[PDB]
Write a protein that binds this ligand. Sequence first.
Ligand SMILES: Nc1ncnc2c1ncn2[C@@H]1O[C@H](COP(=O)(O)OP(=O)(O)OP(=O)(O)O)[C@@H](O)[C@H]1O
Ligand SMILES: Nc1ncnc2c1ncn2[C@@H]1O[C@H](COP(=O)(O)OP(=O)(O)OP(=O)(O)O)[C@@H](O)[C@H]1O
Ligand SMILES: Nc1ncnc2c1ncn2[C@@H]1O[C@H](COP(=O)(O)OP(=O)(O)OP(=O)(O)O)[C@@H](O)[C@H]1O
Ligand SMILES: [Mg+2]
Ligand SMILES: [Mg+2]
Ligand SMILES: [Mg+2]
Lengths: 545, 545, 545
Amino acid sequence: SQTLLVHGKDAQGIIKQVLSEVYDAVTSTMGPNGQLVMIKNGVSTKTTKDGVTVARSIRFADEAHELVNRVITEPATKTDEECGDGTTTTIMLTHALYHLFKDFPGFQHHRNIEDLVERVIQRLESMAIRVEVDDPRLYQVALTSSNQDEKLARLVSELYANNKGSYPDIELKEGVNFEDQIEQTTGRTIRMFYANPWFAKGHQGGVTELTGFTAFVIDRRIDKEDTQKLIDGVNHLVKTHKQHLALPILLIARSFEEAANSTLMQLNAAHPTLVEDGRPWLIPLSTPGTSELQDIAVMLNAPMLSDVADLTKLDTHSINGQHGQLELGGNRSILKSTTPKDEDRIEQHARGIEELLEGFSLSDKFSVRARYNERRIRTLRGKLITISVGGETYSEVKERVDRYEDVVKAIRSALENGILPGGGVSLVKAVFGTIKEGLEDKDQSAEFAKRYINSGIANELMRLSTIQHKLLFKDTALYKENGSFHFNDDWLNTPTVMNLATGEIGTPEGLGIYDTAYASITALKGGLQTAKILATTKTLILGEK
Amino acid sequence: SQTLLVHGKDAQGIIKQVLSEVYDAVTSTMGPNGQLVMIKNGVSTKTTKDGVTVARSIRFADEAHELVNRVITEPATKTDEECGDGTTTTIMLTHALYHLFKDFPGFQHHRNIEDLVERVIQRLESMAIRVEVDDPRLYQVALTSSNQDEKLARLVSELYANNKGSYPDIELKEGVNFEDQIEQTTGRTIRMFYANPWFAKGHQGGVTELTGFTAFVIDRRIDKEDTQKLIDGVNHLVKTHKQHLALPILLIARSFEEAANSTLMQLNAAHPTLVEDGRPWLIPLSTPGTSELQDIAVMLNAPMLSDVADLTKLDTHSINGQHGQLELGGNRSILKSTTPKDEDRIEQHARGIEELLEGFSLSDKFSVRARYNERRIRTLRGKLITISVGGETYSEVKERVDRYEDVVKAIRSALENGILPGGGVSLVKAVFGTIKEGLEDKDQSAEFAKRYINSGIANELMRLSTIQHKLLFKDTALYKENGSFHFNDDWLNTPTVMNLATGEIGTPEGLGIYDTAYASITALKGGLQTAKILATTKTLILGEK
Amino acid sequence: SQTLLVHGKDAQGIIKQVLSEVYDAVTSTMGPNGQLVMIKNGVSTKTTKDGVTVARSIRFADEAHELVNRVITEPATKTDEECGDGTTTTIMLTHALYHLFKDFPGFQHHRNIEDLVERVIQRLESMAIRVEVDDPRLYQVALTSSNQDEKLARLVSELYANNKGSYPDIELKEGVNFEDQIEQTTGRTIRMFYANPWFAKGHQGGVTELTGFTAFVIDRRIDKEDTQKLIDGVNHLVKTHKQHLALPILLIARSFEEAANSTLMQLNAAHPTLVEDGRPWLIPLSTPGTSELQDIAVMLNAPMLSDVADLTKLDTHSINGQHGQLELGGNRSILKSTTPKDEDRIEQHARGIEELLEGFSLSDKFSVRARYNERRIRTLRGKLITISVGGETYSEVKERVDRYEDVVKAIRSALENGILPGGGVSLVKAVFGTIKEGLEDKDQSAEFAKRYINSGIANELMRLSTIQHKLLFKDTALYKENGSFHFNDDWLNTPTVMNLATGEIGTPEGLGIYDTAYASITALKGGLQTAKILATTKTLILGEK
Ligand SMILES: Nc1ncnc2c1ncn2[C@@H]1O[C@H](COP(=O)(O)OP(=O)(O)OP(=O)(O)O)[C@@H](O)[C@H]1O
Ligand SMILES: Nc1ncnc2c1ncn2[C@@H]1O[C@H](COP(=O)(O)OP(=O)(O)OP(=O)(O)O)[C@@H](O)[C@H]1O
Ligand SMILES: Nc1ncnc2c1ncn2[C@@H]1O[C@H](COP(=O)(O)OP(=O)(O)OP(=O)(O)O)[C@@H](O)[C@H]1O
Ligand SMILES: [Mg+2]
Ligand SMILES: [Mg+2]
Ligand SMILES: [Mg+2]
């Protein structure tokens, strides 16, 4: 608390200071050859090489330094929460691209660097190799994302490939045995759960299994304002349309406040003739992106309803009670028994979501809009599996669960969006390609030269694509010969790397070293934004008002 | 809190400091001739030569230093908690091997050091002398691991040798007298106990002795979910199959949450006709690795059950009420009376476990998987003995209790895995062997030389094998003659050492100086991992997030 | 808290400092001519020459210094708690022998020093002059241990001699008069007392005098586990065997936890027919060494029972209700009336303990094992005496009570083990003897010379025996003539010292200056151990974990 207002020379110095310290720490963990980082936590020591774990728990003493550290760390942390295996890359490029922005000042050069790197992104996005569950590269991806786990990669790839048709939903548990053990189901994880613990069997939040139901999906949040219309709708359904009905009635919605739940408790007590063995016949269900309720509506054959007053005006043409088999729960509900007649409705709705993705743009295919829509497909078509992960201690069991979770996140986003050849190669191919593409094109080579090549940006950006390949294999067998390394035509056609597990030299495709497309793309995208932000900041404020 | 991120040169410096300080402390306590360490605790002074106690209670002021200290200590602390007498050797070799790793940098050399030490481990695993309880070397191992306790070694060794057939399970109590006192039982310690104090005789966690029971082993944990099925199962067992039944009914499980206990309380009161002299006829038993329950099932002739619903579907074929003698208890349960009919089932199951160990690999025979399967054997075949340890004060009693427990843990893991000749000899013979074996073999000498001998790692490793033998006998009779010492072929054939108790000079085999195999192996195994980690760490984080 | 790990030079430096500081403070107070020490406590001044009270209350600011202080002080403090008058001699030799240990480093010398001093202890052990209560040297010991109290020494040595047969158990109360007043009894002090204050007459911790009782001695501690067996055994004892029973029933044991006490309260409530004048008929009694309970059993004709269940299986052969006279109390119980039939049993059990001591080894006679068995004998055979000590003020009364207690403790351990001539003479006679013995012995002179004489240890140890005699009399009339003092053959045959009370010169035997054997031996014993510990320590750890 000497000075709270840092401007100009002082500001950029601290940004550079922090970036170059965060760079040094996280990049040292890269690949299977990476060096280790010890981390304190009270009275223990988690000693690690997983870049995410490093980046997240790096802290700084000065508030000014930690201010900037949050800006460098929060992007790369936010890659792995959605993607799976791709944080150290993001930081590496953040550093690299910042360096570039400073080499070429003046804010016409800054707009040029963006446009160039934005076209490098497009070339990666087009380089995305699409892959089926049948393919043996999925193993090769898992093998890479697991830091070479022969026993794990095999399982998850075998698990996806044995379900050649339906995309498996995986969850994890801390197991008891040394060996791993799997629990396959024909079950679909659904996002609805109990509003109040009173509505379960036994009246304290238990797991109520049903063999018949009649669902209704409401759009609005329900509070003290809707208590009149529920009593209007519920007594309308039970009095008039009792003939075509299978109990219990499920009132699925966004939210049920405590005023609404206490009203529905009285409505179950109002008609005790329908209470079979304790089970309440009326359940309100909640969900914490409006189209996810339309999935829940389609899975249970329930009508989509905007207002709570719509429950009165209903008919046998809109009302249809299912005779399947559901399991209501406190965290989430699960559907098991689905008739072939129902799965025809669900597959047709799934194709309909997929036909939207067929017609998206290439850059839109990697958007959050796209990734949210693909989350809906897995909820609809997707069997449930639970793996109880083992190990020799409690600590290895918990350690191994994370590495399962990284492989599941990677395999899912691999076949979802694409695959690229690893070893820092696809970045070099993309940059060296994008330069040559605009240059080779006689239509625009007049100006493309004047902006990027003539200025020197092109040659700088090409040097920076090397960064990843250098950091992996500098100080190895591959780099000892010929001083540094020649990235000539001959290399670009058949790009040699080293498998750091074995030692042998070959192509990434040949050795079996593959990155997830979504990672090495979203690393670059994030690298540019965060480099720009860092490079274009000239004022730090620490004042707590 | 000047800097929370320590990279590179600084990082290794602190690691070197904290290792070499911890080395200088703990290694000073080695052997019977070892020097002492005074330890503060509030308002008292523990003065000790026990390297475990030193290593465990070494602390550092700087958080960064303690960060590394924990990584050096926790492996050595981790040996004694499963082994018995072998902590100082672990730290010694952590130091030595760290020193090696740094002398040969570059991450091809590192992989070579590992593989060379890894092959030395295999030579120590093959050097393991397999020993029976009859053997007078068992005394010599106890004597060694007791720092020359003529009285103690003699007792425990005699105690193992007098039961030539069944492996003793020993426990220790704070005895009152000057003399020790022994309480032999024909009992088998079993890992089950009361879920609630109410289910004992007198209804407050007392010791219930039985002379007849009918057991059942459930695999799942039991909570509010399982209350219904218990009432279905228990009434089904008492109403239908009451004819072939010896009370009480035992319900052995993983865990019983308080809901399940209160249901089984009511079930005892429900059928008061069967309550003989207060004793509840239904007892739920808890155990804090599913195969240990299978052992419990096999000892009691109880059927193994996956679910709680399985209690309904049962018959005279699966139900069997034993007329033995069991003593239920709060901490544990004890089976004393076993009919010759029953022990044939148990021994055949015990053989089956040994037949899995027969066929395990050599390095797998020193795995946690292996040692867990040997724990099962002692639980099945094994008599219970309790020793009330005596001494001149309260403090010498409590002191002598640990020296008992160190000797029991050693003798057990000696005959379990193996024995080696001590005095730091076995380490030298192993290394000087492993170098000569690969070098003498004309098949692979061409490359073995190029990696290990020609580089200099082979000569380096040989010198570090001598560390233990030097630390013990440098500044003694043995090292006075010939300046230092000549580790020539002559010494390798018959290695001379000094017994630090008596003072005479001879072979470890002659003088009676033997390390356990599981100690001096797991010291090297843990020495390598921890030397790698230290040598390959290049970042320290102290940030409380 | 600058550093929490002091090694090597610095560790020994602080030890030397602390030892030499404790040496200067405590040895100042030695003898009658010793110089005073003023001690602070809050808001008052204790000014003293009592070496125990000095050593105990010496404190150090630095944690590391106090760490070492505890190790030098706790051994000297632990002499008086069992001996009486012999703490300053212990610290002196702790210093002197530390000095020796460091002059001769290298751990073959260390073992030679130990064995030499061990043999000096054996010469002190044989020089012990055995003494009967009739002997006038008992006055001369008391005089020495009272710092020349003409009146006090006279009382105590008369009080032992007057009871020429049974050994007196003495206890002290703060008296009211100027004079002292004695209260003789034919009673035996017993270590048992109330578990809870309910069981006394009037139900609130009063003194209960009984004139008949039926005792039972249980070995185990009693807790919530045992409450049922108490209800079985007590009702068994009252229902079946009421004919041969005198009330009340005493359940003597190791400990009674609050659960068991509440159960026995109900048991007194259960049979109100047997409650005579408020007195509860069932009392539990606790004692804070199983053979001390066997004494209690033998004194009260009660059976020795290993388990609580053993109360059921009993008979008129095992049950014997005494009609003596017993006074139950809150601190301790007292037995007054013993029929000559019963004392015939108690004397026979006393002889059996004496027959064990008769046949102990010489060095075994000075062990803790030996002394604890002699403690038992006094409990059995011995009359109770209570002296109320008076004086001019309250502070003189309390001051005089401690000097009383010191003289009783010395006289007891004087006639128990032996007596030696004081003035620091016995030590010099012992050391000069032990050197001459082995050296003059033809059989071992060869190697005796090479170990002690030829190295220089013998002459160093000869000088250090003088420390006591030099401290007492340097700067007196005795040391003025002939520079220092010639410890020659002439002196050894008749050793001259000075009575520091009178000022006359003569032999210790002649002037009537006598140490107790156990003290001067226990100073040298512990003085070696503590000198060795200090000398061999090379690591200090201040870390609270
Ligand atoms: N056997 C191998 N040989 C060569 N390169 C490899 C090998 N395994 C992985 N890689 C490369 O290492 C890089 C990945 O390193 P790492 O997994 O440490 O970074 P990250 O994925 O960003 O971090 P995190 O996994 O913590 O999110 C990729 O470029 C990949 O091609
Ligand atoms: N009488 C002896 N003479 C020579 N060496 C001995 C003797 N007794 C034990 N040793 C050696 O000393 C070493 C054991 O050291 P020490 O017992 O101090 O530490 P540790 O067993 O590694 O761990 P812990 O502190 O748990 O006992 C072994 O190498 C053993 O061979
Ligand atoms: N009148 C005396 N003349 C000569 N020496 C004496 C006299 N009285 C006592 N001493 C000597 O003083 C020494 C006893 O020391 P002192 O009683 O001061 O302390 P301590 O017995 O070692 O321990 P404590 O402080 O518990 O009494 C003995 O060596 C004894 O011979
Ligand atoms: Mg990972
Ligand atoms: Mg030990
Ligand atoms: Mg005194």
